[PDB]
A = this chain, B = another copy of it.
Amino acid sequence: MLDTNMKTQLKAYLEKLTKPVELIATLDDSAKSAEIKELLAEIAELSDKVTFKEDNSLPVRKPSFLITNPGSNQGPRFAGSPLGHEFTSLVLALLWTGGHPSKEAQSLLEQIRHIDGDFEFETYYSLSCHNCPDVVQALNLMSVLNPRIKHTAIDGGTFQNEITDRNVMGVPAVFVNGKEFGQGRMTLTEIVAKIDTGAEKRAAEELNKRDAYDVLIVGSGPAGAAAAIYSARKGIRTGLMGERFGGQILDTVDIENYISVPKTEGQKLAGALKVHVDEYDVDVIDSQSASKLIPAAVEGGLHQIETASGAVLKARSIIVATGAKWRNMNVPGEDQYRTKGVTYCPHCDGPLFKGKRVAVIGGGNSGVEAAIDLAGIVEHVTLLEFAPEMKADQVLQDKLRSLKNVDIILNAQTTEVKGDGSKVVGLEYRDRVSGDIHNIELAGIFVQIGLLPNTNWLEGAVERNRMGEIIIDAKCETNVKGVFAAGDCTTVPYKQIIIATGEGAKASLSAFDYLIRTK
């Protein structure tokens, strides 16, 4: 079966074996079974560390053989001929099983050992195929590294009926637990990536190892970033964790009121915040969400933050800077025209609409103030109120109705934002009583339905007002000793970047003062 060349190479690699290896065949009386038998004999005679056994009573394919260690049933199975262009695959299988290490990275190898699921792989190959080896070898290696991962490599030239019954149209053809998995060349990395779902757990295990922090800042927007800088500058152990470094500003373009910078941009500004943070000793943790706070049982103890990923961080002081989310209209066109006429901020975008018509969505204090605000700058304001009447303070309603370039539409529910492919040109809405549809021509839509502070994760831990805002005092202190908050998520009455950053700096100074008095 093997020629002189093949024996020579094989004997060369068998000499790299440390551990003994068993080849357990299950055969019938076919010529192909005889060939396999002859084959395993030739390999065995090339090494005192390779033993050939039969066990023809096993419920596996005939012929096939298992590549395993003494006293084990773990390892790759080859059904049919393992020669032709699978010869290298066979050789590698003997090697790995007998102790010889893979060339793959250790990140990859550990990942494979830690795969947390039960998988039975079957690879259909043929002896002339050039894409098959890499696939077969990848799966083979996994069977060696992880006993929950099983692999049988099948020669389609021996099991033609399986090829036909299973409607395999090309090789290599992979199935996992009976389901089609892949076709064509896949890398070990790719295969591992298809089935591994342990990334979240690994990240969480990294985090669990972190030492306690002097200050742990939750939320990495402008407020959290500012706090981190003020904290780290004092040389204390500072952690900064957040879902997305940069916060709300990543979703805007032009910013013209970040004091002393006449014009910057949301993405650019977040990049600058990151550079400023990285000048100091800040442990920045990204793509993580605090899911619970557990206050120290007594003052001076450690506060604990749990993450959605399952980790627990601990710290002598906490700064909550999780900001907020504006409520959307949830209509077609809305997302598409964000920064192109749809805006959530009159303080920010008001001056860009001189001589233009705009709408304000929402009739509470925010919307109605926004309307009055814009009315003094723009040519015309239409306010849309969903309900039969506005909720805003009466003095605001009176003021707005006194304005000459304003109309108010009650019972009005936006249905669509209309643009010209580039910017907003109008608004479609429904009158909720009659059901009639109406269109308004305008250049801007200020959505002012309400703000949603990112604080429900804190329910029962720290006190919030009736709007979800974390109640703070002048020192950014919550009702929990050692726990502070800064920026949009708090009761700070205005939501702006320069405001958030000032608060993050106050909160950080307060947290430091707290550490001095309790440590």
User: Using a CB–CB distance below 8 Å, which chain A residues touch chain B?
Assistant: 222, 225-226, 229-230, 233-236, 256-262, 269, 272-273, 275-276, 279, 347, 350-351, 369, 372-373, 376-377, 393, 395-396, 399, 474-475, 491-494, 496, 498-506, 509-510, 512-513, 516-517, 519
Contact = CB atoms under 8 A, between A and B. Distances in A.
22 contacts: A226-B259, A233-B351, A234-B350, A234-B376, A236-B376, A256-B279, A259-B273, A260-B261, A261-B276, A262-B275, A347-B509, A369-B513, A373-B512, A399-B517, A399-B519, A474-B474, A474-B491, A474-B492, A493-B506, A496-B509, A499-B502, A499-B505
Contacts of A494: 505-506, 509-510
Given A260-B269, A493-B510, 4 more contacts: A222-B259, A229-B257, A234-B377, A257-B505
Nearest to A260: B272
Contact of A257 (B233, B236, B262): B233
Contacts of A510: 493-494
B260 A279 contact: no
A262 B274 CA distance: 10
A229 B230 CA distance: 25
A36 to B, nearest CB: 70
Contacts of A259: 222, 225-226, 229, 273, 276, 501, 504-505
Contact of A498 (B226, B347, B369): B226
A500 B503 CA distance: 10
Contacts of A496: 505, 509
Nearest to A272: B260
A396 B517 contact: yes
A262 B233 contact: no
A15 to B, nearest CB: 59
Contact of A503 (B395, B502, B513, B519): B502
A444 to B, nearest CB: 16
A493 B475 contact: yes
A369 B516 contact: yes
A236 B375 CA distance: 12
Given A260-B273, A395-B517, A474-B492, A235 B506 contact: no
A272 B491 CA distance: 30
Contacts of A233: 256-257, 347, 350-351
A516 B498 CA distance: 23
Contacts of A225: 259
B505 A376 contact: no
A500 B502 CA distance: 7
Contacts of A369: 513, 516
A339 to B, nearest CB: 19
A166 to B, nearest CB: 60
B257 A279 contact: no
A509 B372 CA distance: 13
A505 to B, nearest CB: 5
Given A493-B474, A494-B505, A501-B502, A260 B276 contact: yes
Nearest to A504: B259
Contacts of A499: 502, 505-506
Closest 5 CB pairs of A and B: A502-B502, A260-B272, A259-B501, A226-B259, A494-B509
A516 B256 CA distance: 23
Given A257-B230, A493-B475, A505 B498 contact: yes
B493 A498 contact: no
B235 A376 contact: yes
A364 to B, nearest CB: 14
A316 B10 CA distance: 95
Nearest to A510: B493
A70 B50 CA distance: 140
B276 A262 contact: yes
Contacts of A234: 350, 373, 376-377
Contacts of A236: 376
Nearest to A274: B260
B235 A262 contact: no
A272 B261 contact: yes
Contacts of A258: 260
A491 to B, nearest CB: 7
Nearest to A507: B494
A229 B499 CA distance: 13
A221 B122 CA distance: 74
Most chain B CB neighbours (cut-off 10 Å) among A262, A491, A494, A517: A494
B230 A516 contact: no
A279 to B, nearest CB: 5
Contacts of A474: 474, 491-493
A187 B229 CA distance: 58
Nearest to A491: B474
Most chain B CB neighbours (cut-off 10 Å) among A225, A226, A279, A502: A502
A472 to B, nearest CB: 9
